[PDB]
Subunit: 462 residues, 4 copies
Amino acid sequence: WTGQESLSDSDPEMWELLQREKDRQCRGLELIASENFCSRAALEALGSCLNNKYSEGYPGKRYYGGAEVVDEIELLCQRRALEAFDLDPAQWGVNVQPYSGSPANLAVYTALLQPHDRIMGLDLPDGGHLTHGYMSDVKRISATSIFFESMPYKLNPKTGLIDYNQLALTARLFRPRLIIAGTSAYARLIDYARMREVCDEVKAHLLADMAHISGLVAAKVIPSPFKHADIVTTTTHKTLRGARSGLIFYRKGVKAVDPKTGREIPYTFEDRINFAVFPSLQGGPHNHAIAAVAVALKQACTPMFREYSLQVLKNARAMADALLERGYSLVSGGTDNHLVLVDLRPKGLDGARAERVLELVSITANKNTCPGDRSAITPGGLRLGAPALTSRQFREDDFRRVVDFIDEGVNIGLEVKSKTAKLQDFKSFLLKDSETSQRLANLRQRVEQFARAFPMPGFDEH
Amino acid sequence: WTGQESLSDSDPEMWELLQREKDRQCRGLELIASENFCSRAALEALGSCLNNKYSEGYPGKRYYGGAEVVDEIELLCQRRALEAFDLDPAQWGVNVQPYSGSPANLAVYTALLQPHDRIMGLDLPDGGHLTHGYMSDVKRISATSIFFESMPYKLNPKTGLIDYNQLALTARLFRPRLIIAGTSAYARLIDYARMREVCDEVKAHLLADMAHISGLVAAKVIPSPFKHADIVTTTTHKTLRGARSGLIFYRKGVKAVDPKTGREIPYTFEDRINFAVFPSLQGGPHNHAIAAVAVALKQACTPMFREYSLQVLKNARAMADALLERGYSLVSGGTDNHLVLVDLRPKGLDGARAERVLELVSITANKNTCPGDRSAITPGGLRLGAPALTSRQFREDDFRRVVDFIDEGVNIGLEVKSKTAKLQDFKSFLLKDSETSQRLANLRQRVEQFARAFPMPGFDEH
Amino acid sequence: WTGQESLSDSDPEMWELLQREKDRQCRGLELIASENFCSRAALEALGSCLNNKYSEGYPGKRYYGGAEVVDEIELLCQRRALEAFDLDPAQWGVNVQPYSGSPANLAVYTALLQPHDRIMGLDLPDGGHLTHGYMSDVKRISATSIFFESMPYKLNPKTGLIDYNQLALTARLFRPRLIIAGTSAYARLIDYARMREVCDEVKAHLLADMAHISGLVAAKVIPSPFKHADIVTTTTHKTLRGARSGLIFYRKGVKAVDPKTGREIPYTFEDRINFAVFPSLQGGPHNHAIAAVAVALKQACTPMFREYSLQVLKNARAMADALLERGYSLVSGGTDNHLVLVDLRPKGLDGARAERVLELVSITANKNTCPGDRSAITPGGLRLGAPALTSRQFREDDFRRVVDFIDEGVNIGLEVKSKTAKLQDFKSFLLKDSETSQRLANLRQRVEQFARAFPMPGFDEH
Amino acid sequence: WTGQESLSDSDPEMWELLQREKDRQCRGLELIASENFCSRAALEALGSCLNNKYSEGYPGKRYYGGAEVVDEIELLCQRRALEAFDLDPAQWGVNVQPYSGSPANLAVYTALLQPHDRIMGLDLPDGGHLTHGYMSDVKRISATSIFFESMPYKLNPKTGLIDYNQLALTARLFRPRLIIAGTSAYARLIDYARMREVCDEVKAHLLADMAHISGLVAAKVIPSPFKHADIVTTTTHKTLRGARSGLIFYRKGVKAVDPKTGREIPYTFEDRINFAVFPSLQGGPHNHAIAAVAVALKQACTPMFREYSLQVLKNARAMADALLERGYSLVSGGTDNHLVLVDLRPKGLDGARAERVLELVSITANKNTCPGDRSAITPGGLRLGAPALTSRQFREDDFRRVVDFIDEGVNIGLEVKSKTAKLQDFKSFLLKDSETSQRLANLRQRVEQFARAFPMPGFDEH
């Protein structure tokens, strides 16, 4: 056993499963807004000799010795992150160690808040994330609600926008120490200038979780949260086309300068943030993942990346206009970013039966809740997004053909409803019936023939 | 931009740093007990197309659709883990989702304990881990002590072994709900049969964190914690030679069978453990890391792996016998596993000055606390281990030559003490003085010439 | 030393102070709504041989022995309490052990709520009590907010009534486990039927703290909280004319009868309430105070007591009509119970300067906050009440003369404002100036001559 | 209804029960150590016109007005308390507002400790109080353990004394923020000089709860806790012969004077203690109870009170010597204060059957736990004390006759054991059997004839 043997020989069983996954991605359409293909150059650094390194601490304060090369890699990633967002090093910092986005959020609450403190964020059914705090009627589901106190704020049902008026009303009576400003299923741009006024009145920190729109802020196509914020957490695997990891930004320097005589009150975010990640919550950083992020951040400072972000917006407005002509209703009347929310209630079909029938035609999409929903098990909407098919060099003319396959698949779903009853009898009718299963076969063949003719970023067989 | 470009062309700067790290590993000796080189077959699966997949939940209960191939990969990793340790599937389970070892521990406390509950584990200065709970005199350093209550137990100063007598005395007065049985700097085998009796008396769960000895239990060279335990957490990157990840085991089935008439009280660990990882603490699993673990677990069920574990023990006893002949004192009088603790107090040199001078000769070792230590900044011991050099096909005859370089480096450190005073004046004397720096150069050349002639597992340039 | 010596001989110094207090009460007017004179028969039982008894527990479950007589006294007080409010013994219980009203509230939170649970009650500036939860902007002032989580609800500024619409809005987003329905500075009757609907929607307990209106509910002059409530706490020294103590009521019996087949789900308030008082929070009951309460509760089941409560209402409406004719503004436009709130802002004088000048004329009244108040140190209102002067056989014709002394004292306060500036210069102008101090002397002589001609309940010199 | 009617006329039923209690006290023997008769002069101030006063706050900082006389009464009680214990006003303070002893303890924890802090005190089965923290195996019984964390320390089984060696061992591993030094069933003097060293090592406050020995410290017969303590809580109704209330002492002034240059670090106990009582935990003080305490504290500064405390000690040593001659075993071999612990195990009778048979002969005594007790429902000891019979002018010659009635009652209890089995069959044999019930009648007549010839402090019929 030398340890230098290829996977094709040592483990034949695992090598076969690794190829079936690559074939599944190249023959189907990907409409999920939280997925994006990764570059080959980043994958070569994700699996290298850096996995065999065990360092603990921060550059210049290592525990063990011999960490001379990894210090230059971590200090290099901290300079490419402050330049991709055009930040001033003397006024901002960055921490490139959290394992993912969810660990990045818990490290912010532990650093700035005592246990059982009050936090306020967007509600989950209305387009917020689970890490912002979530409770059921009989159980605490999220860890943020187990160790802290949470209270949500909701939207305006008749417009679909965030209700800033009611937010300022309940904030004075609840008085939270932290307010979160981030969404995961929202089609409009958040008004950061208004949420800053609510925080200055009740005296609280403002956290901006921009994990979904992180790739658009770097290309300067939408206004940046950094203008009115104190802490900014983001992921590196959503719209940045990088390896899975996390990032944390914080301000540093003078705060309320000139309060009396010649005083200079400074920010105190730097020390508390670094201590919460290590040695409190985490152990040894994944040095291989940090190197893959530095490769992706360098690609975000190029003219090519700006032309990619401009196409993500044009591919979303082209898909939204095509749906309205077919006879559909969009939540909030349109879109301003990279995703489109659909409302299928006028069509007479729910999002649960539509998501299933599209899965058999190799079209991936997830159901979404709508403001007028009586039952949660059958949402009446879908959530579509354009960041992953754009990587395969899709254009506006190609996105209009995707709608033709979607509208044709919904019509097949409106025939099964006229013959079945319960949803459990809907899934079993798409298989045992030879008539419905034959029409589904003629549609799957036309989708795979169309999607297989586009380039796929990555390697070439795994 | 096609996305299929090699790292040598797209990012020349990052490619140069990736080669300097590979050269540093092949020319130096590695004596840290928490490091081990990884196979090439595992690294090829760590960086593949599985990074571009976003699944949430567990097999058969996915959120989105299209997760047909990744379900077979996750179910395959759950069968290779129960077979590497010769477990019965009807009596044990496994969870292969935690990001690392530290997240694996916090997911156990959140599932079985309410906030501000009592936990008892080994003290950090005495050979325990930071995730078991640790507090300073003025501050809470570990997250386990921030969200839960902790109280440690200590060793016997005059023997170096765990004091089981005092453990049963303070357990009746503190009455903890959970007891941890795991070490990170211990040279003997823990007595699990005795710690089980303490848990049955005060009625508490027993957790066995075997992250350090996980590779020896699989080869059946030392007794297994599974015989007297309920939960077992371990890492996959210490002695298993795999990618960085985590594992959690739990019992299932009947518990106190036949309590009355024909009752069968079952275990209730399965549901609470799975819910604590998702959706409470974590988000999307790293599917690429899970595939690399299944490649490494398959290598642990082979006759070749047993011959490797037998050599790890013989290489430790050979290094321990060589140190006693040179005139040294070992903590607890010897070793029974993969590491050796040294006591340099009779030699007149501390572990802080010894760790530094060895770093200049490309010999990596970390200082360790000793039972009679007045100051914590200058520990009087070292922690040496044999699992990584054994991967490069080292033998007993080669480990005796490593001691010749260690004993020769300590003698150089005993000359600087006769000329300097404060430790800050010790680091600056090894550089500016041309006489001491020249003798250090003649020793570094002989170490690199010796260590470069052994095979290195991995790829061949990165 | 025999121990049977009168206070006039053994302690001459304390006997002189005990007579100066009795003279101060008989020569001045008492307008505080939280005070009432006590009967002589109750005071004779407050200081007897029952002070020399040490029992612990509840009747039939005593710790020590010999508690044969005190069991009949405690069981007698539990029957007179259920009869004064016309309660059914098979559907209600009572606990006659809390030391006062504040201890009675904390014993309810500890029995039905875990630590750090959510409670909602009326805000302190708006007419609620401090034991319902209160927090400053920089500090937690009340013990209810230190051990539990609280969030208040407010009034309608333009009407002065409780805003039930906003209460149901914030209750769905905060979801409290307990809602309190009690006031200490409110002139209207609370709508218990509406607050019951808010509790049935979010599933929470309803607590009715009726410490202020406890004497009116017993006489059946206002609707009783018992019709829509689960727990009722009250004091025995506000409008019941008894010794200082506390009471706790709770329902018992079937709850949601007939849920399935022949099930009968019962109430579980009885055991948890009794355990929270003893042995959790308190020690040995004050048996002398319990005997004085049984004497006062027997007087509340008489026709004489109903004629007293009818006069308390007529004496309040007569005082309110007299103030409007003089040129004053009442909060909420009038009164429906035993107190009257005044608004002095149109008159050009604040409540801080008015409360002080009335104290020099032996007229006791406390300032009250008004909805349009910029500064909290100078409230613009007063709080007047009629339960204590009614005990001295005051009538409507006599209450109209009290307003003549109040309106004459305010006019003296409007002259000092034209000569002074800061409030600290207002207090010092009422003493050093011989002209203002002489006019104050001619008014004090006319008040004491009028108030000294009415009977005073109690003894006759102490 | 004038309100000036005697209790004999207005409430004939309550007046009859008030006389049966006075007759029960004058015809029986009282051996409980937590009871003592009260002076007539104190009872006259307990029930006066001060009950009809509602003040809130502290002297000089009242809420309402007109509190001119009660300020001189509260300031007078604060001077008699600092003089009864010979304290320096410039170095000590006092708070005379807590309702009883149990509320006095909770006000100390809330002022100096955050929620869920660590406290250590004597265990309940071993002679400590319930307010020091107590937990069962399945439930939290005390409120101190619900809001704070507690861990007890125990005695030495083979000597009966406090084990100071084990206390210093577990204190370093638990590290509590507060240590309590007070007992309720202990026959020896606590070593305060040793417990002070344990607090200086782990840096913690020392609380001295001297509720039982408060009357002996004032007479200078035993060493005072004030020499080595920071906070001292006590009751006024145990050995001080006063009304039921509470007291809290605290140090003030310079602490670690001269730490650097000319610094003077002061104590910070004054502000935090006063805020915890009001407005946090309590409401309106019972002014009638405060006046009765000032009458009792004045009697403690007299030569007559010292002669009373000297007789309490001589009456305990005389009762202890008489028990050893009869053939009994005393816990810890004797007594040093006001109580005597007995061990009935050699006699073959338990404390449960002995306490019952003595109750039928009008001899009151409570059972006590012994170090070798397998079952808690049948303790093998009794707790006897001498502070209440000494008030009736008992002497050493009279206490020897009490033992003759005790030893004669135990012999009657040793006959029923030879005829019955279960304890439930023991209680029913003392009534239905005419032979055992007749011998009990001849003994009760001789006790009442003897105890009725001694003076009883108080009034003369109630």
